[PDB]
Amino acid sequence: ASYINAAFRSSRAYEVYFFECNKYVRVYYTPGKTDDKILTNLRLISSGFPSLAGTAFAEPGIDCSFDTEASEAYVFSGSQCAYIDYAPGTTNDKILSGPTTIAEMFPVLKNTVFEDGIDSAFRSTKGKEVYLFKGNKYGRIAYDSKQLVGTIRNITDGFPVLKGTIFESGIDASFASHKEPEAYLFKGAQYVRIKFTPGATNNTLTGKVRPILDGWPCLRDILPT
């Protein structure tokens, strides 16, 4: 069974987009409570985002994503990526850059562990940084300069709080919360909420590692796939 393959934080307060294969939902979420609700019922990506129809991002779907600023996000499908405006509340979504390869979008990533795919990503509170995860490795990109910030290390070199959890070996999906500096990390059937600390190993777990459907019961009729 499969769960969440990608996520990103909307410009709209307390909205999140979740991608599952070739489909997605938009959820109005509630930190610390099982009061999340669906705003967009399970829909093909190609329907929600006609700009993506006929691309890898629609079929087989989006396998990594992150929000940047405004109503912009990067989306990924295998080695391909695109910069989009997801234009909430309208039909004005559009591709701003690409589709192209990861290495062409972000030349600093050419020849790195990220060039053939990214597993997960989320927006940092530090500047324009975005966390990138691939296997048990992670780095940070500043989206606006496209600079790799530092080096690509083990997840637990940045996030020792995740030692002894399955997240130490990789993350399937993630997004930054509207409640800063929290983030949600997903791995198969499970998730955890963290408070992250850029440049420090002061990150905390907010609660326990638990099944997604326990914390997000509004998803129980659509997951797993």
Author numbering: 1 to 225
Give me lines lifted from the publication on this model.
Here we report the structure-function characterization of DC25, a protein from albumin fraction of Dolichos. The analysis resulted in identification of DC25, a 2S albumin homologue abundant in legumes. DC25 was characterized to be a monomeric thermostable protein. For the first time, we report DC25 being a plant origin oxidoreductase having peroxidase activity.
The structure of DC25 determined is at the highest resolution of 1.28 Å and provided better structural insights. The structure shows three monomers per asymmetric unit. Each monomer has a β-propeller domain, typical of the hemopexin superfamily proteins. The β-propeller domain is formed by circularly arranged four blades around the channel perpendicular to the plane of the blades. Each blade is composed of a β-sheet consisting of four antiparallel β-strands. The central channel consisted of four innermost β-strands of the blades, which are arranged in a parallel manner. The narrow end of the channel is lined with acidic amino acids, while the wider end is lined with basic amino acids. When the monomers of these proteins were superimposed, it was found that the core β-propeller structure was highly superimposable between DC25 and other three hemopexins from plant seeds with Cα RMSD values in the range of 0.32 Å to 0.54 Å. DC25, being homologous to CP4, LS24 and CAL, shows significant conformational differences in the loops connecting the outermost β-strands between the blades. Out of the 7 conserved water molecules, three water molecules (Wat428, 455, and 520) were present in the cavity whereas remaining four water molecules (Wat429, 437, 487 and 519) were buried and exist between the blade interfaces probably designed to stabilize the ß-propeller architecture.
